[PDB]
Every structure is written in C-alpha cells, then in structure tokens.
Design a protein around this ligand. Structure first.
Ligand code: 6NT
Length: 249
C-alpha cells in the first residue's frame, strides 16, 4: 500500500476545491500542496484564468515540471461547439498543458451522437496544433447506463481524445469502480491503450480507493501502462492528505 500510495501521489492531478469562487491565494496554496515531501504530483487542475499565476508559483518553488490542467465547456457540457472551441482556445493561450472539455452528454442521452464527435474533434484540432492534451469528461454519473458510458467513450476516442475522464466532480455521482472499468474496457477493446489514458474524478477519496482503481488499470493493461501520460487521479487535497498519511506524513 505504501508503494501504491506513492505511485498514486505521483499520478495525482491535484484539483481545486473552489466552485467558481476561487482566488489567487487559494491557487497559490494549491500549488504549494502539489510540492509534497515525497515528491511532486503530476499536475494541478484549476480554472483557466488562474493558469498564469499558478505557472508563476510553480516556477517559484522549483517545480516547473508540474503540469497544469484546466476545463472547458465545464461543468455543464452544453452542445454549443463554437463556445466550447473558443474556451479551449483561451485555455490554450492561458498556457494550459491539458484541456478537459465536457462531452455534450445530455445531447447523447437525447439520441445525438454526432454533436459529441464534432465538439470533441473541434477541440482536439486546437489542442493538437498547440501541443496540448485534450481530455474528455463524459460525466458517467449522468449517463448511468453502461451502453451510454461505452458509446460516449467510443465517440470521444474516435474524435481524437487523448484522455477520457469520468466526471466533472460537480454532479451527484462521480467515478465508481464499475464506470471506471467500463471506460478502461473501451480503451482496451478499441486497441487505443497506447494513445488514450483514463482519469477517474469524484470517487477516489482514500489511499485504499487509489489502490483499488490502480488495480483495475493494472489488471486490464498490465502494471506498466499506468504512467503519468496514461493514468491520473483527478482529486482534491483530501485524497493527497490520505495518500501522505499512508506514507506517515
Ligand atoms: O479533477 N478533475 O475534476 C479533473 C478533470 C479533468 C481533468 N483532465 N486532466 N486532469 C483532470 C482533472
């Protein structure tokens, strides 16, 4: 477990706990937390307008390698591609290393598969031209059905997603061991394990959970697959406190 909690800490994408009431001071506190006694988390997850100050802080503490992830079309997941695209172009210009666009899942739940494909594809073309990763949040907690979770995963992957994410963290249900396994099974069944990673958001509170979720990835792809590029824990500082507590900190 000590080996798992450290492995997980380095895969963490430390997310802000703010709800659009974030502040520069809170983001600076978050940047300092990403610098743990046992090493750095892979990235932080913050709102676009705080990327410049976060980048400044990360360079000031000697951790310029910590990546910055942000969100667009978030958390609503509306089906307006122009707005989602513009927000992605802004996140790119802010300096984001990765942009997590929210899939238009309500449109899928109403029977529209194309809008999600075009939306993801439009944002991927922008992130790719800027050397930025595009993650796609499909919001498993709202899709609920296994078939819809797979469909949204397949569509996102076909549209060029570099990572598929379970949840925004803003709805009733986030990641679960079931939905996480479903999405990773899609990555395997489509043979895209080399180019598509997985990120659970919302359902990983403790070190035991981090070990459980990593066990699924190891089981399905082997223990070597879950590196910084192909796996990450989108979670707040509470999980980091549990991961550190398991390591005696
Ligand atoms: O923690 N998160 O809510 C979250 C969402 C999307 C992401 N993409 N990369 N890291 C992410 C973290």
């Amino acid at each position: 477990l000590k080996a798992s909690s450290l492995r997980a800490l380095k895969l963490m994408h430390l997310a802000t706990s703010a709800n659009d009431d974030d502040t520069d001071e809170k983001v600076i506190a978050l940047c300092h937390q990403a610098k743990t006694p046992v090493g750095t988390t892979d990235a932080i997850f913050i709102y676009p307008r705080f990327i410049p100050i976060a980048r400044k802080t990360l360079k000031e503490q000697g951790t310029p390698e910590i990546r910055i992830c942000t969100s667009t079309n978030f958390p609503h997941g509306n089906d307006d591609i122009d707005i989602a695209l513009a927000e992605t172009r802004a996140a790119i210009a802010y300096g984001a290393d990765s942009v997590a666009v929210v899939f238009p899942y309500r449109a899928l739940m109403a029977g529209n598969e194309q809008v999600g494909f075009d939306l993801v594809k439009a944002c991927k073309e922008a992130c790719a031209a800027a050397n930025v990763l595009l993650a796609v949040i499909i919001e498993t907690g709202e899709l609920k059905d296994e078939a819809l979770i797979r469909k949204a995963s397949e569509i996102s992957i076909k549209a060029g997603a570099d990572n598929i994410v379970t949840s925004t963290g803003k709805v009733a249900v986030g990641a679960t061991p079931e939905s996480a396994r479903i999405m990773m099974e899609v990555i395997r069944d489509m043979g895209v394990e080399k180019t598509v990673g997985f990120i659970p958001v919302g359902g990983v509170r403790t070190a035991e959970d981090a070990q459980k979720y990593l066990a699924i990835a190891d089981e399905l792809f082997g223990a070597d697959w879950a590196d910084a590029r192909h796996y990450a824990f989108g979670a707040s500082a509470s999980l980091l406190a549990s991961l550190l507590k398991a390591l005696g900190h």
